[PDB]
Amino acid sequence: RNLSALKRHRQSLKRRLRNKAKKSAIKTLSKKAIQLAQEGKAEEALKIMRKAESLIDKAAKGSTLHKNAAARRKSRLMRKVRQLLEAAGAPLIGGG
Amino acid sequence: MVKIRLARFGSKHNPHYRIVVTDARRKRDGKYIEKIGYYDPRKTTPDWLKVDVERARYWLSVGAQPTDTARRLLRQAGVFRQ
Amino acid sequence: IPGEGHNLQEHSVVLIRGGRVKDLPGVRYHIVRGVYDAAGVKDRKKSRSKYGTKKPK
Amino acid sequence: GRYIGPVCRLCRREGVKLYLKGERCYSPKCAMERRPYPPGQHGQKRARRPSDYAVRLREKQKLRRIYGISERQFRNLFEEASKKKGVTGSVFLGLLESRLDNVVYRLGFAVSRRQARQLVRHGHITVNGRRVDLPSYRVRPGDEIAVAEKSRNLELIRQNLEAMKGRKVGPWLSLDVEGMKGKFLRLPDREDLALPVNEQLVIEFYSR
Amino acid sequence: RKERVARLLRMHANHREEVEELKAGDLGAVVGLKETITGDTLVGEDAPRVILESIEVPEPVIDVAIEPKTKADQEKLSQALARLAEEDPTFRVSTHPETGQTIISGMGELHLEIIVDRLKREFKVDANVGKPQVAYRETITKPVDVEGKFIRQTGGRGQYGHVKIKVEPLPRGSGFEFVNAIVGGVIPKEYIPAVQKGIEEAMQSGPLIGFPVVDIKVTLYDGSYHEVDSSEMAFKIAGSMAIKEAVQKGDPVILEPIMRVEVTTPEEYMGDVIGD
RNA sequence: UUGGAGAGUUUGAUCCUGGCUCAGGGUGAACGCUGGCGGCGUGCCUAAGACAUGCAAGUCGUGCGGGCCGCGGGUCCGUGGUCAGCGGCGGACGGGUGAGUAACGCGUGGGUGACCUACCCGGAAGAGGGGGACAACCCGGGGAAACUCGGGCUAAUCCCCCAUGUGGACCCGCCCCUUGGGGUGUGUCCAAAGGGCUUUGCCCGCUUCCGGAUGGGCCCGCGUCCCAUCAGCUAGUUGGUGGGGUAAUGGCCCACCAAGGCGACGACGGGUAGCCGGUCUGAGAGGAUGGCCGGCCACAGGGGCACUGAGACACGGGCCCCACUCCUCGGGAGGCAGCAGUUAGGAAUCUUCCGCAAUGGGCGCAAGCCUGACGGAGCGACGCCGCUUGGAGGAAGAAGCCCUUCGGGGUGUAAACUCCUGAACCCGGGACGAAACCCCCGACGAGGGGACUGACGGUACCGGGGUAAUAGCGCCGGCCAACUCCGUGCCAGCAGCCGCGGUAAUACGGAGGGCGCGAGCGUUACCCGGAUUCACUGGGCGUAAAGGGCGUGUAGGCGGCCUGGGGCGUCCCAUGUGAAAGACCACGGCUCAACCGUGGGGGAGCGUGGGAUACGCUCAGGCUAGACGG
RNA sequence: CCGAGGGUAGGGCCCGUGACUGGGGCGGUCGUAACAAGGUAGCUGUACCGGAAGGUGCGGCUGGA
Numbered sequence A: 001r002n003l004s005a006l007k008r009h010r011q012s013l014k015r016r017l018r019n020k021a022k023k024s025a026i027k028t029l030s031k032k033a034i035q036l037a038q039e040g041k042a043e044e045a046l047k048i049m050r051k052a053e054s055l056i057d058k059a060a061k062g063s064t065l066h067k068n069a070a071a072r073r074k075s076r077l078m079r080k081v082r083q084l085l086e087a088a089g090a091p092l093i094g095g096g
Numbered sequence B: 001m002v003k004i005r006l007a008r009f010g011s012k013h014n015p016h017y018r019i020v021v022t023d024a025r026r027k028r029d030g031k032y033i034e035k036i037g038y039y040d041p042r043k044t045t046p047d048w049l050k051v052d053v054e055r056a057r058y059w060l061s062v063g064a065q066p067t068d069t070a071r072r073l074l075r076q077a078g079v080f081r082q
Numbered sequence C: 001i002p003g004e005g006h007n008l009q010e011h012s013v014v015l016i017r018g019g020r021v022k023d024l025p026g027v028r029y030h031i032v033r034g035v036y037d038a039a040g041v042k043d044r045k046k047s048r049s050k051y052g053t054k055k056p057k
Numbered sequence D: 001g002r003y004i005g006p007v008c009r010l011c012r013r014e015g016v017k018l019y020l021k022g023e024r025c026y027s028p029k030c031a032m033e034r035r036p037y038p039p040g041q042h043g044q045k046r047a048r049r050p051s052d053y054a055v056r057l058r059e060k061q062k063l064r065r066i067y068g069i070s071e072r073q074f075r076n077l078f079e080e081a082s083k084k085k086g087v088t089g090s091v092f093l094g095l096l097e098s099r100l101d102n103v104v105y106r107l108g109f110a111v112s113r114r115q116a117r118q119l120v121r122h123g124h125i126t127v128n129g130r131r132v133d134l135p136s137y138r139v140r141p142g143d144e145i146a147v148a149e150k151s152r153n154l155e156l157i158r159q160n161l162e163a164m165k166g167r168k169v170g171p172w173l174s175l176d177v178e179g180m181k182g183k184f185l186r187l188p189d190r191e192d193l194a195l196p197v198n199e200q201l202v203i204e205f206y207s208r
Numbered sequence E: 001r002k003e004r005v006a007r008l009l010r011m012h013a014n015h016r017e018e019v020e021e022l023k024a025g026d027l028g029a030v031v032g033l034k035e036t037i038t039g040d041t042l043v044g045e046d047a048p049r050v051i052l053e054s055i056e057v058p059e060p061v062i063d064v065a066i067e068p069k070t071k072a073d074q075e076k077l078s079q080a081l082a083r084l085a086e087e088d089p090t091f092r093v094s095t096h097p098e099t100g101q102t103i104i105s106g107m108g109e110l111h112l113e114i115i116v117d118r119l120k121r122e123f124k125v126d127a128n129v130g131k132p133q134v135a136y137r138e139t140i141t142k143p144v145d146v147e148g149k150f151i152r153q154t155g156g157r158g159q160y161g162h163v164k165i166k167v168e169p170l171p172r173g174s175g176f177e178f179v180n181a182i183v184g185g186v187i188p189k190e191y192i193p194a195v196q197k198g199i200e201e202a203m204q205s206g207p208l209i210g211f212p213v214v215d216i217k218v219t220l221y222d223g224s225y226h227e228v229d230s231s232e233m234a235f236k237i238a239g240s241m242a243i244k245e246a247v248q249k250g251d252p253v254i255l256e257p258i259m260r261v262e263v264t265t266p267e268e269y270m271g272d273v274i275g276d
Numbered sequence F: 001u002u003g004g005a006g007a008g009u010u011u012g013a014u015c016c017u018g019g020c021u022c023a024g025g026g027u028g029a030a031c032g033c034u035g036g037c038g039g040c041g042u043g044c045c046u047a048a049g050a051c052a053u054g055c056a057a058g059u060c061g062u063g064c065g066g067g068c069c070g071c072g073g074g075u076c077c078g079u080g081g082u083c084a085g086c087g088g089c090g091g092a093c094g095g096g097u098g099a100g101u102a103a104c105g106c107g108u109g110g111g112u113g114a115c116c117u118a119c120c121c122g123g124a125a126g127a128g129g130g131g132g133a134c135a136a137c138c139c140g141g142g143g144a145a146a147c148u149c150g151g152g153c154u155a156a157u158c159c160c161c162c163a164u165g166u167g168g169a170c171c172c173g174c175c176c177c178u179u180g181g182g183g184u185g186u187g188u189c190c191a192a193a194g195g196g197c198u199u200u201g202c203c204c205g206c207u208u209c210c211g212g213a214u215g216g217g218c219c220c221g222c223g224u225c226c227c228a229u230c231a232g233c234u235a236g237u238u239g240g241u242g243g244g245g246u247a248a249u250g251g252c253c254c255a256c257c258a259a260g261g262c263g264a265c266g267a268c269g270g271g272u273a274g275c276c277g278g279u280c281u282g283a284g285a286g287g288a289u290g291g292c293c294g295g296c297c298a299c300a301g302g303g304g305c306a307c308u309g310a311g312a313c314a315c316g317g318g319c320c321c322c323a324c325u326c327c328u329c330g331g332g333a334g335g336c337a338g339c340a341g342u343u344a345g346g347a348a349u350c351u352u353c354c355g356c357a358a359u360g361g362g363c364g365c366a367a368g369c370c371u372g373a374c375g376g377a378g379c380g381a382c383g384c385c386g387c388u389u390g391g392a393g394g395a396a397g398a399a400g401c402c403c404u405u406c407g408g409g410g411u412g413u414a415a416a417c418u419c420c421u422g423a424a425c426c427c428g429g430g431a432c433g434a435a436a437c438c439c440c441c442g443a444c445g446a447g448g449g450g451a452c453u454g455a456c457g458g459u460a461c462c463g464g465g466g467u468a469a470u471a472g473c474g475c476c477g478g479c480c481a482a483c484u485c486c487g488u489g490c491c492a493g494c495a496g497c498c499g500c501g502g503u504a505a506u507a508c509g510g511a512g513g514g515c516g517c518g519a520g521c522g523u524u525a526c527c528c529g530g531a532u533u534c535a536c537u538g539g540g541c542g543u544a545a546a547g548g549g550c551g552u553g554u555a556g557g558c559g560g561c562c563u564g565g566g567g568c569g570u571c572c573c574a575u576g577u578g579a580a581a582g583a584c585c586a587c588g589g590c591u592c593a594a595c596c597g598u599g600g601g602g603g604a605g606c607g608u609g610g611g612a613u614a615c616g617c618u619c620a621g622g623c624u625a626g627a628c629g630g
Numbered sequence G: 001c002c003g004a005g006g007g008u009a010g011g012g013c014c015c016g017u018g019a020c021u022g023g024g025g026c027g028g029u030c031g032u033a034a035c036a037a038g039g040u041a042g043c044u045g046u047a048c049c050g051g052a053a054g055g056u057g058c059g060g061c062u063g064g065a
């Protein structure tokens, strides 16, 4: 029967909403890139993971990711897309 | 942030503070970093203020903040007088 | 129950301190006079404390 | 607080004259001069040999009674002497000699230590100028046990001063008469006094 | 025991009311009290620790006259009843003034057959009992007015009391009443605590069967004195001559003890019981 | 070298052994009888049972757009109140409690090339353009309530896209470095926000980076209670490779593979407990303990969960289950182990008080606002310390009472009386605790100057005036200080142990007298003490309790003479750590003291570095006196 | 997928309680086993027996002759 504690709560519903949203696309896109490196599909993969890379740091701009997380998120995305492409090269365009 | 504050000791009706550096958020008479002077604001003796001005200048330089009525006593026995 | 005469009986509310009586084996506790329905002792002048008796005038 | 009540009886219990009263003490109207025997129904009775306990009991009693002090403060003092550096039996005697209500006595401002207390308590006495009304004050060497100069106009203080013109005070005291003030020069030495207290005994007593 | 009255409450037909005080003559409910049971006397912290007359009347109705027989083994029977009168508070081991003797009061024919059974067979005591148990009282039926003189202006050594009271019948079961309306001072301030005792002993022996007189009102309204010959034991003998005489005046009546009785019987003997 | 007392009790007597019992100190105490003043502490130990009501976290109009009351008048406009709303920071601190936990929880010392840190302090770089949503508000349904819902409008320091790239982030390579540490190169990736005054300019904000400071996470050695009538335990168990998760390591989580891991140096299991600084006891060694203050953990009715966030799995935030209890038939509300307070339980534990003056905290440029933290007041002899109930005089000595050999003896200078002081009260004055934030000059800095602000409290204290002004409790056989009469007659009763009482009781009850303490004295409960009666200091086993019935041997303990190496134990020096409070010694502060300040002195124990080499260890060589053998 | 907890079924340890029963400690009846060579030396492990102590056998001990 009191407080602007509830104001803090309404404020968290929208907050979690944007994080969830951001974090979603990230996974989706990253997986999608990696899926394309699993066939390769050279040009397409990077194209995505590029857009993926973007969404990673950009999320970490706000209160969504840590820089280290965005750092890990970026690390493996790259390690996986690349190692995957080692089966059939042609790594053009650019992320290497 | 970190601070220069008045930790109270002494008795009831016997304020004997300890101008001290601590984290903003301790209990007032709680565990600080360093003591840098005393201050019997009742002046029941000669030296009721004692600031190790050397140290009071260090903490200020690293980043410490001071109670508005701590500089009242840091200034009084001059820490800032260039 | 210590002293001369007492007012205690079935259903008396009572208070007990420890300390046994040598000769009364099994009895291992003492009733404290002047508390609850335990009377102090009438006509007791010496050691009134140990017998829950108020001072005369 | 302090005892109060029949005090001839103390001395005659103690087998020894203590100077607890005042003027009468020296007179042959002292009951001890007449009845040098323990008070109560069994006084003139062929006493039974003391116990080492009795012996150290009585020696302690007299020593406290002499100064008219609570059993607790006496003991309090005594333990502190034991903590303090050097001889305990002496430092004790010294420490309880440094007590303001007793200093006022040696300095003769009054007759009994009993009478003395009341002076200090009432404010009639002071130390180093400033008035001091507690019979427990540690008179620390270098001090001015004046009369409250604003209570010099009185029939009793002059009177006991009247009677103190030239008696030699303590070797540790400096009664400048007329000016109504003394000085605590240095805390007493052991031999510096001879009351009927075998101080070694009060020690063995509290060590039971 | 100290106790701390926190809030103070009043009760209406529909709501509770907090009040900041309760003045004398009035009443209400007090929160905060802990170990205070009913029938108790709360005073203020700095006030006369008197106890109000709450929780009253004992009260015995059968007297058996036990004589200590013989004769120096007396004070052991007095040491028996003493422990008894701590084991059981109801009964009074009262002493009779004129005849001088001890009297075991009680609560029924039986209360003395369990006491003076144990009193002989659980101690020893060389003593014996009769006795009836005649336990009536006395009172007055109409108000009358006399004088309580003690006109002995002789000897020079004391002996003068003069007393005037209006003695009226009280509601039964009520007991004693004493209102003190002395006007002017015609009897000094120090002859009240001993004209009341002058009355309070006069009712001890009655005018017909000679039993305690209760249920009266004694209004002390007048009386003279002689400052030289007036003694405190001259108004104390004055009020004994007026009270033991005004009770003889306006119709002195033997009041008598009565018992509510729960008899348990089989249905067969009911009528045999009842009609008896 | 400031430190160490013992006694009663087994016998007819003794010596020894040996148990029991007692005098001591201590307490968050409590019970009896008694109780005057003040100071400082301190007070639910039990049901972490249930709780009525009031309060305990909010703030910024110098982020943004709005709805009424006013205010100078031309239904206009500017402003400042005001309730919200959006947005920011706080709400994770501060306060409570010890249920759970035998644990990396705590202590103590270290590791992190395995990481975090809002606000605060430096240093480097910047703020270019563009778009967009949601509340508010207008409108439209339900409820006897919480309130919700669809449509449209809209501001920003809300939101997003392009840009710039000091810089940072990832992949691969390369140089250094050695667990993921620094630098470089090519590809890719990522910044942003405006408000205000006195207005070519200062101020408070934002942006990406590196460093500091402080607060953390994680890890490791060593230390932490009882039961072995708990002896065997373990399948995410133990390791591996891969991956998910995090700020980060890790079986933390998942897939697979390997068969491990722990255990008499006590695993597993059961009991019990929050740990430490300290505290109490003790000659010490040791034992006991963790209330209050400080430090860390843990919990927020019982549970689980995650959101938001620098930070929580969040006491007075959200969701779900349960139990209980409350608001009217759909659905709701609650969470005092915050401050008070109620109730229950109990032998027992407080005011529903005052104040934000101080100190500290949150927000704010500031003025200021909130602060049951805190500063104080109330109650409780709970504890310690300070004081009072008077002081000098007064008879070979009243009365009353007690004893007596009948002469006396005692209470007893005690009292009555004599003077003298003068707690309480009465009058007057009356505080430090408070100089800063703020205004001015300087420059919003240094420095100088001035003003407002005190709950305690008209209280302390000072000045004058001034009344003889509470005493109570334990004990008086022995330990143990204090002795007589009467009553009682193995009765009634006492009692810690020996024991006392059966008609002459220093032991029971009263009296007188005495002893002992004194606003206290006794009692019960519990701890250490005495108890060298768990014995390391510091005991024992022929007969007192106690040598295994006897061998063999496993682990373990211990082990000759000489010389070399090492330096693990052991010894020494230096150095870091051993917070504050306490303890100690000195000095000071409140009239003393309790209490309280400043200063000093440090130890043990662990980390690092140096040294010594006798003894113990270890390695090598040698011997023959132990042992075995011919 | 996991998951508070609910349910079902089977086990382990603890506590309390139970007709009745076994001794155990504290305050008349039968004998007389022990203490003196205790009137059969005593004790002892074991075995069988007996109202009860206890007796007897076998072997042992001396704390016995």
Ligand code: SF4
Pocket: D007, D008, D009, D011, D012, D017, D018, D019, D020, D021, D022, D024, D025, D026, D029, D030, D031, D032, D033
């Ligand atoms: S000495 Fe004389 S005066 Fe002093 S006390 Fe003894 S008897 Fe009384």
Ligand SMILES: [Mg+2]
Pocket: A024, A028
């Ligand atoms: Mg999806």
Ligand SMILES: [Mg+2]
Pocket: A060, A061, A062, A063, A064, A065, A066, A067
């Ligand atoms: Mg972030």
Ligand SMILES: [Mg+2]
Pocket: A063, A064, F309
């Ligand atoms: Mg987050």
Ligand SMILES: [Mg+2]
Pocket: none
């Ligand atoms: Mg990793």
Ligand SMILES: [Mg+2]
Pocket: C009, C010, C011, C012, C013, C037
């Ligand atoms: Mg009853």
Ligand SMILES: [Mg+2]
Pocket: C013, C037
């Ligand atoms: Mg009752």
Ligand SMILES: [Mg+2]
Pocket: none
């Ligand atoms: Mg005066």
Ligand SMILES: [Mg+2]
Pocket: D206, D207, D208
């Ligand atoms: Mg001692």
Ligand SMILES: [Mg+2]
Pocket: D208, F005, F006, F530
């Ligand atoms: Mg001793």
Ligand SMILES: [Mg+2]
Pocket: F009, F498
């Ligand atoms: Mg005996």
Ligand SMILES: [Mg+2]
Pocket: F010
């Ligand atoms: Mg024997």
Ligand SMILES: [Mg+2]
Pocket: none
């Ligand atoms: Mg004997």
Ligand SMILES: [Mg+2]
Pocket: none
């Ligand atoms: Mg012994």
Ligand SMILES: [Mg+2]
Pocket: F023, F480
């Ligand atoms: Mg004693």
Ligand SMILES: [Mg+2]
Pocket: D208, F024
């Ligand atoms: Mg001792």
